[PDB]
Every structure is written in structure tokens, then in C-alpha cells.
Amino acid sequence: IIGGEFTTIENQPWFAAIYRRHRGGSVTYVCGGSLISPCWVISATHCFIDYPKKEDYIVYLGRSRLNSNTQGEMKFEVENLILHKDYSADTLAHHNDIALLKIRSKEGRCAQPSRTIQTIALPSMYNDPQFGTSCEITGFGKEQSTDYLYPEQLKMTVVKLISHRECQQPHYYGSEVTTKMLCAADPQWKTDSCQGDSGGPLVCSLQGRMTLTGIVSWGRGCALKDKPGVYTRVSHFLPWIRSHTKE
Numbered sequence: 001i002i003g004g005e006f007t008t009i010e011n012q013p014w015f016a017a018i019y020r021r022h023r024g025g026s027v028t029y030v031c032g033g034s035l036i037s038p039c040w041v042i043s044a045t046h047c048f049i050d051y052p053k054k055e056d057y058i059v060y061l062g063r064s065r066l067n068s069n070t071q072g073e074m075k076f077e078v079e080n081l082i083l084h085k086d087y088s089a090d091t092l093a094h095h096n097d098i099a100l101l102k103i104r105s106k107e108g109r110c111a112q113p114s115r116t117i118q119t120i121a122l123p124s125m126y127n128d129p130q131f132g133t134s135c136e137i138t139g140f141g142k143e144q145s146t147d148y149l150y151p152e153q154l155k156m157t158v159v160k161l162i163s164h165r166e167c168q169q170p171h172y173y174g175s176e177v178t179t180k181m182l183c184a185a186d187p188q189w190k191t192d193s194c195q196g197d198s199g200g201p202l203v204c205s206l207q208g209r210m211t212l213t214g215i216v217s218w219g220r221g222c223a224l225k226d227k228p229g230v231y232t233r234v235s236h237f238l239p240w241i242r243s244h245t246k247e
């Protein structure tokens with residue numbers, strides 16, 4: 001997250017921290033995600049596509065810091081890593097950039113809701129806030145495009161939804177952005193998601209309920225003039241989520 005503020009898991013208790021076990025035993029951060037029911041986390045396919053083996057991954061819920069344990073955290077293996085069959089990547093834009101992780105603990109249990117662990121509501125079908133609406137984004141990604149390190153403390157910021165029409169412009173993204181994507185940005189371009197924030201939530205309040213409107217997907221740099229953040233438009237993927245979240 002470029003700009004914005006530090007936070008703790010209490011302020012985004014659906015946030016899931018996803019890590020990968022290396023051949024050699026070291027564990028490194030991969031991507032964010034969001035708990036959408038006790039057993040299901042939703043993230044982005046591009047985070048996993050290079051290493052699709054579910055055994056390689058660890059999911060933490062209730063975690064406020066990147067490389068230290070947070071009191072009350074829960075640790076999960078990935079029982080099912082579901083990538084989107086229709087995912088594709090061009091030079092910049094990712095299409096169908098959405099993924100599901102079914103989580104189960106070593107004790108064979110799903111998430112137990114707590115002060116630091118809660119689900120987030122999905123939107124209703126094609127129901128998005130109007131452009132200009134303020135939404136929040138959360139993650140452990142870079143604080144500056146030129147950073148090597150990721151921040152140790154969780155961060156969040158506020159961006160505004162941009163119309164598909166404005167985002168289609170040439171000096172925005174041209175035809176790179178589709179109706180299954182949402183653009184969001186700061187009017188001063190001063191704050192944004194960045195590398196390491198992928199898979200994490202864009203949350204808006206809709207009919208008075210906190211709603212997973214977007215999933216961090218891609219952008220041309222970070223907090224760059226005329227280059228909004230691009231998010232998977234969750235309200236356009238409900239059939240896929242429905243069809244994949246059962247027995």
C-alpha cells in the first residue's frame with residue numbers, strides 16, 4: 001500500500017495472509033486474500049499460477065504482522081487451490097484474475113470467528129457502488145514502488161471507484177480494462193495498492209453493509225498519474241464462486 005495508514009487485523013478481520021513453503025524450508029509471503037466463509041478464502045489466480053501445488057501454501061487468519069506471529073492468529077493448510085480455468089495474462093492486464101482456497105487446520109477445522117477473524121459479504125449480482133465512491137484496500141505490499149522490502153505492519157488506504165468509461169481512455173488503460181474489472185484511484189494519485197497487495201480486498205459499504213467489491217489484480221506502476229489500480233470485479237464472478245464452493 002502506497003501512502004495510507006498502518007492498521008491491525010481488527011480493522012480488516014477477513015484479511016488472509018498467504019505464504020509459500022520453499023524447497024529448503026523457508027517461508028515467504030505471496031499474496032493477500034479475504035475470508036468469504038469459514039472454509040473459503042478468495043484471492044487472485046496470478047499469485048499462484050507459477051506454483052499451483054496446494055501443498056506449498058500456508059494461510060494465516062488474524063495476522064497483523066508479516067514475519068512475526070500475532071496473538072490469536074490461526075494457521076491453515078490449503079485443502080483445495082482452485083484457479084480460474086479462463087485466466088490469461090497480457091503484458092500488463094490479467095483476465096479472470098480470481099482464485100479460491102479451501103482452508104483446513106492440522107486439527108481439520110475451518111475458520112473460527114473471533115475479534116480478529118470474521119467473514120466479508122460478497123456483493124449481489126452486478127451490484128457495484130457508483131463511480132466516485134470511496135472504498136478501502138488492505139495489504140502487506142510495498143510502501144513505495146522502489147522499495148525492496150515489504151512492510152512488517154499491515155496497511156490500508158482509501159481509493160475512489162472510476163467508471164469503465166473513464167478507465168477506457170487512451171492515457172488511462174485504453175482497451176486493456178474490461179467490464180469484469182474495476183478501476184480505483186486517489187484523485188491526487190498519492191495512494192494506491194502495489195506489488196505484494198495482489199489478491200487482497202477492495203471493500204465498499206453497499207446498502208449499509210461492508211462488501212468485497214474487488215480483488216487487487218494489476219496496474220501500470222503504483223500511485224502513478226493516469227494509471228489507476230485495477231481490481232477483479234467480484235459482482236461479475238458470483239456464478240464461478242457459487243459453482244466452486246460446494247461438495
Ligand SMILES: N=C(N)c1ccc2cc(O)ccc2c1
Nearest residue numbers: 193194195218219221222229
Ligand atoms: N497500481 C496498482 N494498484 C498495482 C496493483 C498490483 C500490482 C502488482 C505488481 O506486481 C506490480 C504493480 C502493481 C500495481
